Amino acid sequence: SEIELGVTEPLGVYDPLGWLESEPEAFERRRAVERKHGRVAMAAVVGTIVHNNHIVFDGYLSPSNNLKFSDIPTGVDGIRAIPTAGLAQILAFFALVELAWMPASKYDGDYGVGYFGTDIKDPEEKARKLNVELNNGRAAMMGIMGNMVAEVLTGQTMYEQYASGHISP
Amino acid sequence: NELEIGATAPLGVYDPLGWLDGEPENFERRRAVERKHGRVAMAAVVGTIVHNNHITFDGYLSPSANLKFSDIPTGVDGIRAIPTAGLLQILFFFALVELAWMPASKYDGDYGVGWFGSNIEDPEEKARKLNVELNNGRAAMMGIMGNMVTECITGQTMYEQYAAGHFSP
Amino acid sequence: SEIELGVTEPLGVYDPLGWLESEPEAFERRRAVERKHGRVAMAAVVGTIVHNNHIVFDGYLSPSNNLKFSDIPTGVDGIRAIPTAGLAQILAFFALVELAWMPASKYDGDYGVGYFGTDIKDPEEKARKLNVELNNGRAAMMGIMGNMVAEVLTGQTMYEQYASGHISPFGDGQGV
Amino acid sequence: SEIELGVTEPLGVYDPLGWLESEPEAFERRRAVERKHGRVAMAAVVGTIVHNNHIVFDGYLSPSNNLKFSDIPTGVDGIRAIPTAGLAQILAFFALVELAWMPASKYDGDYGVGYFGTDIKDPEEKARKLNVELNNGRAAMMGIMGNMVAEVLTGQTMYEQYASGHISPFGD
Numbered sequence: 001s002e003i004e005l006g007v008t009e010p011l012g013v014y015d016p017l018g019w020l021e022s023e024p025e026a027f028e029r030r031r032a033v034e035r036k037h038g039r040v041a042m043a044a045v046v047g048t049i050v051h052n053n054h055i056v057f058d059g060y061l062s063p064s065n066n067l068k069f070s071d072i073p074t075g076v077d078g079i080r081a082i083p084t085a086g087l088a089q090i091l092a093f094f095a096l097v098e099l100a101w102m103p104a105s106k107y108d109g110d111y112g113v114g115y116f117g118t119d120i121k122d123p124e125e126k127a128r129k130l131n132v133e134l135n136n137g138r139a140a141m142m143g144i145m146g147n148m149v150a151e152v153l154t155g156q157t158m159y160e161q162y163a164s165g166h167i168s169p
Numbered sequence: 170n171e172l173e174i175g176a177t178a179p180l181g182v183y184d185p186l187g188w189l190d191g192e193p194e195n196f197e198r199r200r201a202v203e204r205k206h207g208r209v210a211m212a213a214v215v216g217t218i219v220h221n222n223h224i225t226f227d228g229y230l231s232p233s234a235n236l237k238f239s240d241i242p243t244g245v246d247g248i249r250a251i252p253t254a255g256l257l258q259i260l261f262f263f264a265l266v267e268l269a270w271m272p273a274s275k276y277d278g279d280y281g282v283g284w285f286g287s288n289i290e291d292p293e294e295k296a297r298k299l300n301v302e303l304n305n306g307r308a309a310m311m312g313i314m315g316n317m318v319t320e321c322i323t324g325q326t327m328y329e330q331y332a333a334g335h336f337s338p
Numbered sequence: 339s340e341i342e343l344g345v346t347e348p349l350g351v352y353d354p355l356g357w358l359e360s361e362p363e364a365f366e367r368r369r370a371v372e373r374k375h376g377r378v379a380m381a382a383v384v385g386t387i388v389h390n391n392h393i394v395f396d397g398y399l400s401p402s403n404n405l406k407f408s409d410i411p412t413g414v415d416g417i418r419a420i421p422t423a424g425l426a427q428i429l430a431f432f433a434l435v436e437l438a439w440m441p442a443s444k445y446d447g448d449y450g451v452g453y454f455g456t457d458i459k460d461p462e463e464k465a466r467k468l469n470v471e472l473n474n475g476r477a478a479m480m481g482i483m484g485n486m487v488a489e490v491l492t493g494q495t496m497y498e499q500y501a502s503g504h505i506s507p508f509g510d511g512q513g514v
Numbered sequence: 515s516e517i518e519l520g521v522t523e524p525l526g527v528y529d530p531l532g533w534l535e536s537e538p539e540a541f542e543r544r545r546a547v548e549r550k551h552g553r554v555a556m557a558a559v560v561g562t563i564v565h566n567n568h569i570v571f572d573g574y575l576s577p578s579n580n581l582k583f584s585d586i587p588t589g590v591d592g593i594r595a596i597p598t599a600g601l602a603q604i605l606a607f608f609a610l611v612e613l614a615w616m617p618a619s620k621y622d623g624d625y626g627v628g629y630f631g632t633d634i635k636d637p638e639e640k641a642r643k644l645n646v647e648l649n650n651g652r653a654a655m656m657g658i659m660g661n662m663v664a665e666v667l668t669g670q671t672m673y674e675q676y677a678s679g680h681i682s683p684f685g686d
């Protein structure tokens with residue numbers, strides 16, 4: 001079930017707070033938030049690879065603002081370069097996802113999609129893949145803000161952090 | 170069970186004409202038309218996306234008629250630029266499809282193929298994917314009609330518009 | 339079963355010779371020959387489409403004979419241009435495949451693999467794709483022979499026949 | 515079900531030393547080493563094919579050593595061209611896989627991944643693929659030795675030897 005989906009070999013039940021017995025009814029929101037934050041962070045980590053490999057959409061993001069796709073910085077100042085008529089489009093389409101299509105109020109996590117559209121019939125398979133989504137969500141949560149404090153402390157995006165050899169601590 | 174396949178969440182069963190509680194014996198063919206109109210219109214919306222993105226087949230469609238693939242229009246007049254010996258090859262091959270291979274008299278829908286060649290083996294996610302085929306079919310039937318109406322109103326294709334900025338009526 | 343696997347809708351059980359009850363014991367090899375011929379002719383049709391689309395390997399087939407891959411004719415004289423030490427390698431590898439690995443004396447064609455490595459557990463779906471393999475094999479058997487006689491009766495490969503606009507029969511054609 | 519996983523056609527059970535009932539106790543490790551040596555060699559003959567086809571990573575492996583990916587030899591001396599600060603990075607990461615992530619302590623060879631993520635539930639489906647992993651692992655062990663031996667007995671790598679037409683055993 002859902003409360004043994006977070007455990008793994010090298011830590012087990014890692015509750016250093018002791019909140020699994022302190023707030024036992026609040027686990028199912030907190031699991032749904034940890035899964036939600038992980039799913040955003042894994043898309044954010046992979047997004048930082050693709051931005052900093054200079055893979056661009058080869059066109060104009062806003063011809064009214066004269067803003068090409070390669071006119072947008074890859075690092076922290078990338079979302080700030082998007083015009084406010086474009087951030088209105090992101091918040092409108094993802095209001096229809098987060099409220100109607102795949103509502104974040106649904107704490108189950110499963111939507112109609114499966115794992116690549118596939119329901120996993122074997123319960124030790126499915127719980128294993130559920131553990132990977134949490135663990136790769138946990139590694140990317142700390143990973144994505146290891147990448148944002150590597151830029152708000154240096155003032156240097158992840159491309160020329162590697163070009164100038166500035167990964168020396 | 171074909172009677173609850175069209176009914177999705179936000180509107181439920183939707184019958185402003187009341188023809189489910191009207192004639193019940195005409196539903197099996199009206200479902201067969203709605204699914205068939207959906208499948209034709211979904212391949213047409215993808216067709217308008219590929220044609221307006223200037224993805225062509227790199228050659229001559231009719232070297233006797235001196236027609237390159239890049240000479241065919243990408244709007245509603247693209248099908249009328251095809252030579253009459255080319256429209257008949259479309260007509261006679263899809264006579265073999267519509268009458269023999271995937272016979273349109275089969276009001277069931279399932280000819281031989283499934284979801285990428287397989288049954289889904291599971292009455293809840295198969296009914297979920299049957300809901301998606303109808304709902305994405307319904308959104309594309311309005312989508313291809315809206316693509317053709319503003320084609321003939323503006324007189325432009327979907328690449329000429331988005332080059333002039335015609336986004337407000 | 340195997341006796342029900344070749345029959346589909348517009349013809350059903352189709353034998354003008356009537357050997358399904360004249361020779362009922364010779365059927366299970368004759369199915370395996372039809373399936374083998376179909377499997378061979380399906381790769382031969384896809385091969386002719388690939389050769390005449392000028393998809394070549396970018397190199398030298400035999401640098402000893404100065405023979406590039408693009409120097410090989412894309413028609414019925416393709417393997418007549420392969421050097422004889424090259425056809426020895428093809429015959430030696432498919433001796434290992436047609437006798438040891440996937441032996442052709444196994445008269446059900448069921449060697450190790452499934453349909454893309456999948457065993458189709460549904461018997462009505464497995465019989466459907468077994469019918470497709472036979473029917474696409476029967477269509478490619480007529481497809482490869484009508485491709486081969488159209489080349490030798492025109493003297494042109496399939497690229498040159500569609501370059502000259504020679505689809506119309508100078509001889510006499512028969513096609514769907 | 516591990517004593518019949520290497521048994522295939524013509525050889526069947528093959529044991530010229532007779533260790534299968536000289537040591538029926540040490541088979542569980544000895545299978546796990548054969549599977550591990552098979553998996554390492556299978557990713558090695560594929561490596562020699564990729565390197566000798568000049569598929570490189572179009573950049574600098576070590577800009578500190580001023581060394582790009584196309585400067586490394588594509589033969590047996592390619593591991594020596596890597597700087598030791600970089601090859602320390604790969605034994606630091608494969609220490610994490612061989613001890614922690616997929617521990618080679620586990621004599622099954624079985625970890626959370628299956629065959630392309632799927633568990634094969636038909637039992638000679640699964641035993642057919644387990645036989646294939648062993649057999650292609652065994653053929654790659656004899657393949658990666660026959661590549662490294664025939665390189666040093668001609669001095670050329672596999673790209674160099676095939677370009678010179680040095681396939682037939684003239685000097686040997």
Ligand code: CLA
Binds near residue numbers: 008027031
């Ligand atoms: C998005 C935030 C978030 C939330 C809500 C959770 C929630 C949970 N974690 Mg998870 N965890 C997270 C991120 C999160 N985690 C990250 C990023 C890692 C990698 C370090 C982990 C590593 C981890 C392990 C190994 C395990 C859990 C477990 C749990 C469950 C324990 C129940 C409980 O109440 O624990 C206490 C409550 C919390 C852990 C969440 C409270 C969030 C605090 C208040 C945030 C405080 C700010 C923080 C210090 C800032 C750090 C960022 C900075 C380093 C840059 C609970 C569902 C256990 C489990 O799932 O067992 C079934 C378990 O074994 N977590």
Ligand code: CLA
Binds near residue numbers: 187188
């Ligand atoms: C090919 C056209 C077509 C047909 C034959 C059907 C048939 C059906 N739909 Mg409908 N549907 C369609 C297109 C179609 N749909 C489109 C484009 C949408 C998106 C707007 C929908 C949205 C929809 C929902 C949400 C639901 C249905 C449902 C149904 C079924 C219930 C019976 C019924 O309502 O009869 C009434 C008759 C009809 C629906 C079609 C008759 C033809 C009309 C009278 C022609 C009028 C069109 C007008 C002249 C031009 C259109 C204007 C403009 C859009 C261009 C029936 C099988 C219900 C269902 O499946 O329950 C299980 C259901 O819940 N449909």
Ligand code: CLA
Binds near residue numbers: 340346357365368476
């Ligand atoms: C490779 C040769 C070959 C062989 C050995 C078979 C064998 C079979 N076919 Mg198949 N068939 C083939 C090719 C072949 N077929 C081709 C190319 C087509 C498409 C035209 C078909 C269309 C077909 C259908 C629709 C059906 C069969 C069926 C059968 C089975 C019925 C048993 C019987 O009495 O058949 C009769 C015996 C033979 C067919 C083998 C005799 C070979 C002849 C005498 C060789 C002479 C041909 C001649 C030179 C062709 C010249 C023209 C050509 C170059 C264009 C048997 C396994 C039936 C079935 O599977 O039911 C269980 C069935 O319904 N066949």
Ligand SMILES: CC(=O)O[C@H]1CC(C)(C)C(=C=C/C(C)=C/C=C/C(C)=C/C=C/C=C(C)/C=C/C=C(\C)C(=O)C[C@@]23O[C@]2(C)C[C@@H](O)CC3(C)C)[C@](C)(O)C1
Binds near residue numbers: 113136144
């Ligand atoms: C809504 C929908 O329909 O979805 C459907 C369809 C779909 C998409 C096909 C399905 C799927 C499968 C999916 C989504 C598979 C993808 C999963 C994903 C995206 C997994 C990333 C993990 C990243 C990690 C662990 C990073 C650690 C980060 C670390 C260790 C760092 O140090 C961060 C880093 O920055 C620094 C700090 C330092 C740099 O020197 C190094 C880098 C740059 C790394 C679904 C989900 O099943 C259902």
Ligand SMILES: CC(=O)O[C@H]1CC(C)(C)C(=C=C/C(C)=C/C=C/C(C)=C/C=C/C=C(C)/C=C/C=C(\C)C(=O)C[C@@]23O[C@]2(C)C[C@@H](O)CC3(C)C)[C@](C)(O)C1
Binds near residue numbers: 285287387391497500
């Ligand atoms: C994961 C999942 O869901 O399962 C999947 C996988 C699975 C099971 C396989 C399924 C299937 C069915 C599939 C994929 C069927 C595809 C069939 C296919 C691909 C059929 C090609 C015909 C091309 C021909 C006959 C060429 C004719 C000949 C031609 C065009 C010519 O000779 C002319 C030409 O050549 C020259 C002479 C000169 C050139 O300059 C120009 C051209 C090229 C014009 C599913 C159900 O779909 C889904």
Ligand SMILES: CC(=O)O[C@H]1CC(C)(C)C(=C=C/C(C)=C/C=C/C(C)=C/C=C/C=C(C)/C=C/C=C(\C)C(=O)C[C@@]23O[C@]2(C)C[C@@H](O)CC3(C)C)[C@](C)(O)C1
Binds near residue numbers: 214215284315316
């Ligand atoms: C025959 C056969 O063998 O099939 C086999 C093999 C095969 C193919 C592998 C299998 C599969 C899977 C398939 C077919 C998956 C494909 C599904 C498909 C093709 C789904 C499109 C949806 C489009 C929508 C909802 C558009 C809305 C359009 C809207 C909302 C618009 O506004 C229209 C638009 O123009 C305007 C008006 C304004 C623009 O600003 C926006 C655009 C441009 C959009 C099968 C089916 O299982 C079995």
Ligand code: KC1
Binds near residue numbers: 600
């Ligand atoms: C965690 C992220 C990460 C960073 C940020 C990072 C950085 C550098 N890598 Mg490392 N690396 C991995 C991860 C990371 N590496 C992983 C997962 C593996 C496979 C297990 C791996 C393998 C090698 C090899 C073979 C070499 C190598 C090198 C460098 C060097 C390049 C700059 C330079 O050399 O001027 C910089 C410091 C080369 C080298 O160290 O040359 C002296 C080299 O030859 N890496």
Ligand code: KC1
Binds near residue numbers: 254
């Ligand atoms: C079975 C093999 C086969 C051959 C050998 C063949 C050959 C030619 N096709 Mg055809 N074709 C199909 C199959 C075959 N075609 C199929 C299955 C379809 C869709 C269902 C199809 C569609 C179209 C369309 C839309 C057009 C078309 C054309 C030509 C013409 C080149 C022009 C020329 O030589 O003058 C040559 C002879 C164009 C045309 O007819 O121009 C007057 C044209 O517009 N085709």
